[PDB]
Each structure stands twice: as structure tokens, then as C-alpha cells.
Amino acid sequence: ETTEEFGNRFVAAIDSAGLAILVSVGHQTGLLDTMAGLPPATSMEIAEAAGLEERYVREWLGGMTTGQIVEYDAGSSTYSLPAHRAGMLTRAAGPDNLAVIAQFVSLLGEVEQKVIRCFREGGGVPYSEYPRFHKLMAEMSGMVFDAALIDVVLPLVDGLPDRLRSGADVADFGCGSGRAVKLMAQAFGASRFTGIDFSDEAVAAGTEEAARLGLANATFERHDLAELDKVGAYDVITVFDAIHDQAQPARVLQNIYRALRPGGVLLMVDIKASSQLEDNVGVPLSTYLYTTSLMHCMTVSLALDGAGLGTVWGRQLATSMLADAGFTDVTVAEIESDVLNNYYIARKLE
Amino acid sequence: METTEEFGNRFVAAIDSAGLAILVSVGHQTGLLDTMAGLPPATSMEIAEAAGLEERYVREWLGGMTTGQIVEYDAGSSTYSLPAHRAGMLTRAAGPDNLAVIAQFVSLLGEVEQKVIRCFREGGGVPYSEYPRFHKLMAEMSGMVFDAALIDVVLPLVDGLPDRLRSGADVADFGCGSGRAVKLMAQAFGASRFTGIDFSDEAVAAGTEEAARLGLANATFERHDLAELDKVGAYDVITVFDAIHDQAQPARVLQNIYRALRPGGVLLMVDIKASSQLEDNVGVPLSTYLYTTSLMHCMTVSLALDGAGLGTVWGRQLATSMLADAGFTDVTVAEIESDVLNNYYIARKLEHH
Ligand SMILES: Nc1ncnc2c1ncn2[C@@H]1O[C@H](CSCC[C@H](N)C(=O)O)[C@@H](O)[C@H]1O
Ligand SMILES: Nc1ncnc2c1ncn2[C@@H]1O[C@H](CSCC[C@H](N)C(=O)O)[C@@H](O)[C@H]1O
Numbered sequence: 169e170t171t172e173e174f175g176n177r178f179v180a181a182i183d184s185a186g187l188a189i190l191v192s193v194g195h196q197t198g199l200l201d202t203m204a205g206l207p208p209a210t211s212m213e214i215a216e217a218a219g220l221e222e223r224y225v226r227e228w229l230g231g232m233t234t235g236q237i238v239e240y241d242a243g244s245s246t247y248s249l250p251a252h253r254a255g256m257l258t259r260a261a262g263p264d265n266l267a268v269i270a271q272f273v274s275l276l277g278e279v280e281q282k283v284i285r286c287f288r289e290g291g292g293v294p295y296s297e298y299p300r301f302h303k304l305m306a307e308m309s310g311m312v313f314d315a316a317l318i319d320v321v322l323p324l325v326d327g328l329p330d331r332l333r334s335g336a337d338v339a340d341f342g343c344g345s346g347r348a349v350k351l352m353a354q355a356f357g358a359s360r361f362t363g364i365d366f367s368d369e370a371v372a373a374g375t376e377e378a379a380r381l382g383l384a385n386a387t388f389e390r391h392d393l394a395e396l397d398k399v400g401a402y403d404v405i406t407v408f409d410a411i412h413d414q415a416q417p418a419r420v421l422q423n424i425y426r427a428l429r430p431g432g433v434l435l436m437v438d439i440k441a442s443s444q445l446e447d448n449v450g451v452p453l454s455t456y457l458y459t460t461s462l463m464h465c466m467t468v469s470l471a472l473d474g475a476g477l478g479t480v481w482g483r484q485l486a487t488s489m490l491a492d493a494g495f496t497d498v499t500v501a502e503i504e505s506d507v508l509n510n511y512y513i514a515r516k517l518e
Numbered sequence: 519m520e521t522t523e524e525f526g527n528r529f530v531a532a533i534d535s536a537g538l539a540i541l542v543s544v545g546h547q548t549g550l551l552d553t554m555a556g557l558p559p560a561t562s563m564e565i566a567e568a569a570g571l572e573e574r575y576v577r578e579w580l581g582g583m584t585t586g587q588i589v590e591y592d593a594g595s596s597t598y599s600l601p602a603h604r605a606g607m608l609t610r611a612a613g614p615d616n617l618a619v620i621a622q623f624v625s626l627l628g629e630v631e632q633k634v635i636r637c638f639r640e641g642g643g644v645p646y647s648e649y650p651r652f653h654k655l656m657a658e659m660s661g662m663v664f665d666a667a668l669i670d671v672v673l674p675l676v677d678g679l680p681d682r683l684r685s686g687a688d689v690a691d692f693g694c695g696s697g698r699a700v701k702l703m704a705q706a707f708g709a710s711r712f713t714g715i716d717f718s719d720e721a722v723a724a725g726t727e728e729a730a731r732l733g734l735a736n737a738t739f740e741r742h743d744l745a746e747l748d749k750v751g752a753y754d755v756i757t758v759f760d761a762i763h764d765q766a767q768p769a770r771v772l773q774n775i776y777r778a779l780r781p782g783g784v785l786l787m788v789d790i791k792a793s794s795q796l797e798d799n800v801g802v803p804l805s806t807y808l809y810t811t812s813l814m815h816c817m818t819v820s821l822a823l824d825g826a827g828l829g830t831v832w833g834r835q836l837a838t839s840m841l842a843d844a845g846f847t848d849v850t851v852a853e854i855e856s857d858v859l860n861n862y863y864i865a866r867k868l869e870h871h
Contacts, residue, residue, distance in 0.1 A: 171603045178542075178607065178617055179803050184535035185624045186810035191529075193631065197638050223827060224638045227817055230831065231809035234800050237529075242797040252522035256529065266529055273536045277628020280540060281651075287548050287575045300632075446593035449585055452530050458582030459537030466578050476574060480581065 187235035188270045190228060191257060195267035199228060203238075204254035208246040263315040263505060269456075271304050276463045283463050292470030295367070301464075302369050306345045309408065313347050316505040318355050324501050325433055325513055328404065332356040336403040339364065341393055341424065342410025346374015346386070353378070353386035360385045362402075366392045393420040398427035406435045409509065412481050413465045415474025421493035431518035434495060436486075440502065440510045443482030453508070454480075483510060490514050538586035539624045541579060542608060546618035550579065551608045554589070554600035561596050614662045619655075623807075626652050627814045634814055643822030649815060660759065661698040668699065669706045675852045676786055676864050679755070683707040687754035690715060692744055692775065693761030697725030697737075704729075704737040713753075714739040744771045749778040758787040760860070763832050764816050766825035772844035776867065785846070785865040787837075791858060794833030804859070805831070834861055841865050 194200040202218040211229055215222035229247050232238035240247045257267040282293050322328055335358035340349045343363035353361050363374050375388040394416040405424055414420050424434055441448055441457060448454040461479035469476040490498050495514035502510060545551040553569040562580055566573035580598055583589035590599045608618040633644050673679050686709030691699050694714030704712045714725050722741045729737035745767040756775050765771050775785055792799055799805040812830035821827040841849050846865040853861060
């Protein structure tokens with residue numbers, strides 16, 4: 169490219185950056201929701217529907233309109249959210265709602281300055297500086313869990329579903345807020361599940377939902393995955409997007425191997441990307457992935473003097489690290505439902 | 519006709535793009551972009567050592583920069599380069615031309631999203647006090663622009679203004695802020711007398727110290743609320759830079775500028791280049807960015823004060839109308855081709871008494 173072209177590109181980028189933010193706001197406010205449930209309408213009409221300050225809404229619509237998400241009729245002075253677009257930005261779109269992931273732009277922006285300090289000074293930014301994250305992660309993750317865990321993900325392991333039905337001891341490591349555990353515990357009443365996280369927040373949350381639903385077969389424990397006394401205690405262990413952000417990932421992978429009874433199974437769902445940089449160029453979401461890794465997944469590990477592999481550790485490294493942990497039978501799967509993650513299946517001999 | 523499959527891709531690209539912004543915003547603040555411009559193809563290690571920064575962070579930054587396509591990468595030799603054509607628009611060496619500066623605003627708007635959202639629900643707005651890093655940055659980049667072209671480009675737009683100031687005329691700058699404007703003019707025009715007005719004492723005191731330090735007798739500063747001025751036929755010349763749309767009571771301020779001017783006096787108000795019609799702004803670069811800073815900042819700061827909240831994109835048609843409401847029956851709107859972000863509204867006051 170030449171110079172004129174870059175500026176256009178880079179200017180457009182700034183406009184896109186702003187657009188992202190606007191979408192996140194539309195999500196959190198239910199504007200995007202409200203508009204999907206509406207015909208063409210005026211700023212005041214849309215504000216009234218959403219139960220919001222028209223003024224704020226008016227400017228929102230402006231940005232959305234220039235960014236070509238919303239459509240405004242110059243003649244009638246009404247705005248409209250094209251349906252083909254509303255099914256990609258609304259809660260009702262289930263897993264398809266892309267407005268969720270835009271929330272991360274602001275969340276990452278919140279620590280730009282603390283991050284820049286680590287470029288100069290080393291160390292990293294701890295989890296406690298990202299209070300909003302648990303909720304976003306739960307939501308981002310929750311989309312794929314409700315959509316696909318029980319009927320798509322668990323069936324990737326032959327006979328696992330049957331096994332659960334029969335009864336088995338199952339553990340979710342780095343469980344977060346216990347969503348997957350809650351779904352599985354209702355789904356398989358004869359199996360007993362335990363979820364583990366080092367957060368009080370997550371354990372509280374997962375711990376709570378179960379209290380509410382009376383799911384006896386769900387139980388929650390706070391532990392650090394790098395140090396555990398579980399030996400041969402689980403037939404099945406899952407870990408959903410928790411490995412790359414660990415401080416001592418190889419150790420957790422050893423700790424998983426020990427806690428599995430022989431013939432047991434590890435299902436690690438982690439981000440899909442190459443461990444080689446060149447291979448990620450022009451792939452959608454890579455720039456977003458590296459950003460988050462730098463501003464979150466990469467730094468939170470480093471803050472504990474950890475490994476800091478980041479979000480983009482990749483397939484190659486991830487697999488050979490399962491090899492190193494003792495998993496001699498390892499296969500990688502993917503699903504249409506989740507474009508982001510690989511689904512690594514790893515077995516322990518009997 | 520755009521297809522949903524198609525939108526998804528555009529919006530994912532958008533998602534990628536926001537991250538790319540932040541990376542550049544970081545690269546500039548870190549001094550990384552500046553650093554690479556001065557290097558030959560090098561390794562993540564070499565680049566981090568060259569910049570005096572932590573390699574691991576530099577590496578994550580480099581990766582995104584590579585995927586975003588800004589930075590080029592020879593995987594064969596594990597080296598990166600910043601192409602000269604790109605280095606040009608992201609380096610501090612471009613002074614005012616550095617694009618990288620504006621990227622910093624993604625995080626700055628990021629930092630207030632939660633408070634802004636609350637506003638949708640409860641009204642009011644986010645107070646000016648919560649935006650210190652934002653203010654200091656604007657002022658730093660305007661300041662370069664003033665250094666770059668105020669005397670040789672901006673003032674000459676007002677026909678016969680260089681002479682008026684050369685001979686010596688009574689000048690005021692409203693919303694002077696840091697005061698860079700006042701300094702440059704008072705340097706270039708020893709004959710004229712300048713006054714800087716702002717209501718932030720910090721700024722006022724600051725300027726006064728700067729004035730005295732440089733020994734400029736002609737420069738002066740005062741703390742006033744622009745909306746509460748009682749000045750009457752004090753100034754031959756009044757300059758206002760990008761400080762009207764943010765006001766609580768803009769109409770009043772314009773009415774106060776009319777009143778403070780002498781008959782035969784001139785107002786130069788610099789403000790954002792946009793239409794007041796929404797339709798007109800679609801397809802014009804940066805429209806989205808501006809509507810965003812407005813909702814996210816310029817609009818709310820006013821609303822916080824029960825203000826007008828006209829916003830960053832109040833536009834030309836509304837600005838001109840407002841001037842006339844204020845009393846100016848003679849107004850021309852100038853543009854400079856180089857500057858695409860601002861309109862230079864030149865409003866003249868009638869000579870009779
Ligand atoms: N050292 C550690 N010990 C236990 N949990 C850890 C940990 N380091 C990170 N984690 C967990 O890693 C999780 C990342 S996100 C949570 C994953 C969850 N399956 C979901 O999709 O919501 C965090 O919730 C955190 O609790
Ligand atoms: N009501 C008011 N009275 C006086 N100054 C005001 C004001 N409202 C806003 N301002 C000024 O608006 C300024 C922000 S913009 C500053 C413009 C400056 N000449 C530049 O181009 O860098 C603040 O410094 C503040 O002093």
C-alpha cells in the first residue's frame with residue numbers, strides 16, 4: 169500500500185473502534201434488544217420504549233447510524249435496525265450475538281495505563297483489577313454452554329454421555345461461575361459434580377445457583393489449581409478457557425493427570441490459533457486475541473510471576489504440553505457452535 | 519444489499535480494529551512506534567532493548583501489530599519492521615500529523631463507559647472532573663497544531679488580521695486553557711495586548727506563570743465563567759478554539775462574545791467540521807468517532823451541569839444560526855485543506871455605535 173491508503177485504513181479503524189464501544193453500550197442498555205422488537209421510529213419513540221434518556225439515545229443512534237448498523241430515514245426522521253443485523257447483536261440471537269464481545273473493548277481500555285506501566289516496569293496486572301470480567305466471561309462463555317455443552321460438546325467423547333447417565337465423578341477446573349457445572353448436574357442426576365476456582369466470586373456464584381435449584385449433586389470448592397491433593401478422584405475433568413491464564417500451567421496439567429482415575433478423560437477447551445505468528449496473519453480475531461492476551465490473559469499470569477503464555481499459545485504448544493503432562497492419547501476437535509476454541513480430548517491409560 | 523453473513527464479518531473486523539487502535543495507542547505512549555521507525559529489521563528482543571522495555575510485553579504487542587498489518591514480520595529470520603510509509607503517520611516525528619495520538623482516545627472513552635451507561639438510565643451526566651487525562655491530551659495536541667500553524671496559517675484567514683495585530687490591537691482568547699495560543703500570538707505581535715480567559719484557576723495561574731517566565735508584558739489571564747461575563751467593547755479581536763460545544767450555556771457565551779467585542783471587532787471561532795444533519799455525516803470519515811466522543815464526553819459533561827449538550831457534532835448549520843442569534847450579521851466559514859477536522863467561522867461585528 170501507499171501512504172494515502174494507510175491513513176484511510178487507520179482512520180477507518182478509529183471509527184470502528186468507536187463503533188465497537190457503541191455496540192457494547194447498546195447491549196448493556198437493551199437498546200439493541202428494544203430496536204429488534206420495533207418498526208422504524210424516532211429518537212424519542214425509541215428512548216420511550218427502552219425507558220431511557222432520549223438525549224443519550226439520540227447520540228447513540230447517530231454513531232450507530234454513521235457506522236452503518238442503524239438506518240435512519242432522512243425524510244421521516246426515524247431510525248431502524250436492519251433485521252439481518254439484529255440477529256447478530258441481540259440477546260435473542262443466543263450464541264450469535266456479537267454485541268457481547270464488544271464489552272471487552274471498554275474493559276480492556278480500563279487498564280491501558282496500568283498495562284503500559286508494565287512495559288516499563290515488568291510484573292503484571294492482577295485479577296482484582298478486573299472486577300467486571302467475571303460477568304463478561306460468564307456471559308461470553310454462557311452463550312456457548314447453553315447452546316452446545318450437553319448436546320454438542322460432551323458427545324465429542326465417545327460414551328461420555330452414557331457414562332454420565334450411568335453415574336460418574338466429574339470435575340470442572342477453572343469453573344468460573346459454575347454454569348457448565350449447573351447444566352451438567354441437572355442433566356445427569358446420577359453423576360456428582362464439583363467445580364473448582366480460586367476466586368471467591370465465582371465459587372460464590374456457582375455455589376449459589378445450586379443452593380437455589382437444590383442440585384445436590386453439584387458442590388463447589390475453592391482451590392488454586394497449581395496445588396491440589398486430588399489423586400485418582402475423577403472419571404472426567406473439564407477445563408474451559410482456564411489453562412492459558414494460569415501462572416503455572418504445566419503444573420496444573422500434571423495436577424489434572426494425577427486427579428484422573430486411570431482410563432479417565434480430560435476435556436480442555438482453549439483458544440484456537442497457531443503457536444506460530446505468521447499462521448495467524450489475516451485470520452479473523454487474531455488482533456483481538458493478541459490484544460486481550462496483552463491486556464489480560466498475558467498479564468494476569470505475569471502478575472504472579474507466572475508463565476504468561478497468553479491467549480495465543482496455540483495448538484502446537486498446547487498439545488505437546490498435554491504430552492508432557494502424561495497424556496499419550498490426545499485429539500483435537502472443533503465445533504461450528506464455537507469458532508474461538510479448540511476442544512482437546514486427552515486420555516489417561518488404564 | 520449487505521448480507522448477515524457479511525455483516526458478521528464486517529463487525530468482527532471492527533472488533534479486530536478496536537484492538538488494533540489500543541495497540542497503537544499503547545505503542546505511541548510506550549514510545550515503541552517511535553523506536554521502530556529508527557530501526558532496521560529486528561527481533562522482539564532487540565526492539566525491547568532498543569526501547570528500554572520488557573520483551574515479553576513487546577512481543578505480545580508485536581504480534582497484534584503484525585496481525586493488524588501495521589508491522590511486517592519475516593518469520594524466516596524472526597524479525598519485524600515498521601514500513602516507512604506507515605512510520606510516517608504514527609511517529610512523533612510527524613508532530614501534528616501523528617495519527618497514533620488520536621488512538622489513545624479508545625481507552626479514555628473506555629474508562630467511562632460504565633458511568634455513561636448509567637446516565638441513560640438516570641439522566642444527569644459525567645462531571646468534567648472525571649476526565650483529566652482526556653483534557654491534558656487534547657491541550658497537548660492542540661498545542662502542537664498552534665505551534666505548527668496558528669501564526670502563519672490560521673490568523674491569515676481573517677483578511678487584514680495580521681496587520682491589525684502588527685499595528686497592535688486588543689485581543690482575547692476565550693477558553694484559553696493551557697494558554698499556548700496566547701503565548702504564540704504575544705510573541706509574534708509585541709504591539710498587541712492579549713488576555714486569556716478560562717475558569718479553571720489552575721490554567722489561569724499556570725498561564726500567568728508561563729507568561730512571566732517568558733517575560734511577556736502583553737500576555738494576561740483571568741478567571742471568569744464565560745457564561746457570566748460583563749465585558750463590553752473591550753476587544754478588537756476574540757478567538758475561540760474548540761470550546762463552545764462543551765458549554766453548559768453556549769448561547770449566552772456567544773451573546774457575551776458579541777458584547778465584549780468592539781464595534782468593527784472580529785470573532786474567530788474554531789470548531790468541528792460537521793453537518794447538523796445526520797444524513798450528511800454518513801460516509802464521512804470520523805463521523806462515528808465524533809458522535810462517540812460526544813456521547814461519551816462532550817455531550818455528557820455539559821448535561822452533567824444541566825447543560826445544553828449540543829455535542830461535538832453540533833455542526834455548521836446550527837453554529838452559524840447560533841452566531842446570528844448572538845448578533846453577528848456578517849459571518850464567513852473558512853476551511854483549510856490540510857485541516858479536515860475543523861471549521862474556522864469568521865464573524866464580524868457592526869461598526870456603528
Ligand atoms: N490458579 C488458579 N486456580 C484456580 N482457578 C484459576 C486459577 N487461575 C485462573 N483460574 C480461573 O480461570 C478462570 C478463567 S474464565 C473461567 C472459565 C469458565 N469455565 C468460564 O468459561 O466461565 C477464572 O474464572 C479463574 O477462576
Ligand atoms: N464556562 C467556561 N468559562 C470559562 N472557560 C470555560 C468554560 N467552560 C469551558 N471552559 C474552558 O474550556 C477549556 C477546554 S477546551 C480548551 C481550548 C484551548 N484553547 C485549546 O484549544 O487547547 C477548558 O480549559 C476550560 O477552561
